[PDB]
């Protein structure tokens with residue numbers, strides 16, 4: 001399906017999952033959200049735009065915050081992803097995986113901030129190194145453990161008696177992902193994530209928007 | 215109080231009479247594309 005790309009970095013894959021081990025040879029994986037999983041990943045200009053001012057309140061502000069990051073640019077690195085998450089699932093491993101491609105050989109930092117009412121609750125920071133691949137360079141975060149806060153959050157979501165209550169909680173839950181060139185501090189990708197519960201028979205869904213000034 | 219209080223966040227929806235969280239504008243009331251609310 002549709003993925004996210006700036007001029008310098010393309011995120012081909014993104015997934016959050018729960019993996020259950022029945023026996024040493026049998027593994028069951030449930031995907032909560034996914035990009036570039038069901039069908040080959042792609043990027044094109046056909047996606048819609050969202051006024052960034054409409055979402056500033058849902059993410060950390062001040063120095064280093066979404067507004068500060070957006071103003072510094074480049075503007076083509078900023079995206080909003082709306083996830084419809086598949087929560088229908090019941091040894092366990094909660095994980096997150098992502099993959100990136102760049103024409104450039106960089107050392108990159110991936111910062112993921114979980115936010116409640118626009119306030120940072122927890123941050124995970126990962127440093128990723130390049131591997132040569134067909135003239136370009138690939139970066140991979142493989143099976144990174146989901147933080148306990150997110151595990152706790154998912155548990156509490158599932159224990160809500162009504163699904164509409166889950167949506168009410170998700171109203172004020174966001175994630176901001178900032179992928180940076182470690183040396184230059186250039187914003188390679190900045191992705192704002194918003195969530196709803198999926199009711200689709202196809203499971204989890206997503207829609208990607210460009211973040212713009214209006 | 216704390217805005218990042220996990221129990222408070224879930225208490226607000228489970229027991230609305232005891233809700234103690236910031237008040238916000240629901241996304242559905244904001245200037246956003248229709249595709250933001252309708253899955254593909």
Ligand SMILES: *C(=O)CCCCCCCCCCCCC
Pocket residue numbers: 016032033085096112114122123124145146147148149150154175195
């Ligand atoms: C803790 O380390 C924060 C890291 C968060 C990684 C993003 C995972 C996306 C969560 C999707 C789960 C769906 C919950 C509605």
